[PDB]
Amino acid sequence: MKLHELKPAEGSRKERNRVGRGVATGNGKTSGRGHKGQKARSGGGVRPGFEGGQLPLFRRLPKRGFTNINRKEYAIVNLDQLNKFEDGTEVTPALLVESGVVKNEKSGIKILGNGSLDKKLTVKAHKFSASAAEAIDAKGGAHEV
C-alpha cells in the first residue's frame, strides 16, 4: 500500500452520527429525544432497574445462599485433552502447565471423564472422576493422586 493510496478494509469504518445538525439529518432539534419529559433533559433519566416507584425486582425477590471461605476450585482436564500426550508419557500437573492444557492451576488438577482416552498414559492429578480413573485403567495407564 502507499501513503497517498491508503484504504481501510470494507466495513471497518463507519462515520459517527451527529445530532442537532439540521432537519434533513433526522436528528435535528430534539436530537432523537422526542418531546419533553425527564429523559429529554440533559443528564436526564432513571437509574437502571428503577421502575418508577414500583418495588424493584431486586428488592421484591429474596437473597439466598452464602460464600464458603474454604471453597476449592480445581482446574479440569477432560480425557480428550490428555490424548495429545504421546502414549506412555507420564502426565503430571507440571507437564500439563508446560503443554498449555492448563493455564491456571487453581486448587489442583482434576481429570474428568468427558471424551475418550485413546493413548495409554500414567496420569498424576490431585483428583480424578470415577469415570476418568476407570478410563485411564482401561487403557492400561495408572492414575495416582
Binding site: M1, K2, L3, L6, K7, P8, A9, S12
Partner: protein, 204 residues
C-alpha cells in the same frame, strides 16, 4: 534469491531471503491498521480549552431573575456569552492505541513483501564509511540507481552511514530492529545490508 550488489554496483553474489518475511502476499487490512496506529502514536494531544468553570470571574448572577425584561442569565462566562467558557471543546488526551503482536509482525512482513514485489528491495554487501561524507553516499545511491525516497537498513547502528545520509533529502537510515511500517511504506526503495537482511529474516 536476491542478488547482492557491491556499492560500485557490480554483483557480489546471491542471498536467499525467507519467503515468509519477504514473500507473503501483503495484508492491506492489517497494514492500514498499523499505519494508522503509528500516526496516532506520534500525536501529542496537547490541546486544551477553558470551560465555564475555568474562565476567570463569572461567579455572580449578572442581573435579577425577573422584572428587568432581559433574558435570564446566571453568569457572564456562560457559553452563549462573548468571553464565555467553551462547551465540550478539545481536552488533553492520547490518541495511541495498541494492536495484537502477531498482527504487528504481519504488517512488517506485508510492507517488506510489498517492497520485494515492486523490486524496491536492494541488497548490498556492506556499507563501509571511515568518515561521514554526504557526497560519497550520494554517489553510492547514484551507482545503485536508487530512487529519491530510499530506506537504508543496517544490521546495527552505523554512525558513519547515518551521519553521511542524514542531510540527503528522501533518505532515511534505520536498523533491522528499528524497522517500522511507516518508514517502509513511505520509502520508494529499501537498501538492506546483507547482515541486516538476515537479522530481519530472523526477527520476523
Amino acid at each position: 534469491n536476491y542478488d547482492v550488489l557491491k556499492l560500485d554496483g557490480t554483483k557480489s553474489g546471491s542471498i536467499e531471503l525467507s519467503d515468509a518475511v519477504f514473500g507473503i502476499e501483503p495484508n492491506n487490512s492489517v497494514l492500514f491498521e498499523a499505519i494508522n496506529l503509528q500516526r496516532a502514536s506520534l500525536r501529542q494531544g496537547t490541546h486544551a480549552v477553558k470551560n465555564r468553570s475555568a474562565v476567570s470571574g463569572g461567579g455572580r448572577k449578572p442581573w435579577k431573575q425577573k422584572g428587568t425584561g432581559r433574558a435570564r442569565q446566571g453568569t457572564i462566562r456562560a457559553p452563549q456569552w462573548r468571553g464565555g467558557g467553551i462547551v465540550f471543546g478539545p481536552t488533553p488526551r492520547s490518541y495511541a492505541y495498541k494492536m495484537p503482536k502477531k498482527m504487528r509482525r504481519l504488517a512488517l512482513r506485508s510492507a517488506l513483501s510489498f517492497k520485494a514485489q515492486e523490486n524496491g528491495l536492494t541488497v548490498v554487501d556492506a556499507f563501509n564509511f571511515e568518515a561521514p561524507k554526504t557526497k560519497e553516499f550520494k554517489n553510492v545511491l547514484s551507482t545503485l540507481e536508487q530512487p529519491k525516497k530510499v530506506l537504508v537498513v543496517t544490521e546495527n547502528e552505523d554512525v558513519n552511514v547515518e551521519l553521511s545520509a542524514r542531510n540527503i533529502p528522501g533518505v532515511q537510515v534505520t536498523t533491522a530492529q528499528g524497522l517500522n511500517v511507516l518508514d517502509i511504506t513511505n520509502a520508494d526503495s529499501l537498501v538492506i545490508t546483507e547482515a541486516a537482511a538476515k537479522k530481519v529474516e530472523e526477527v520476523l
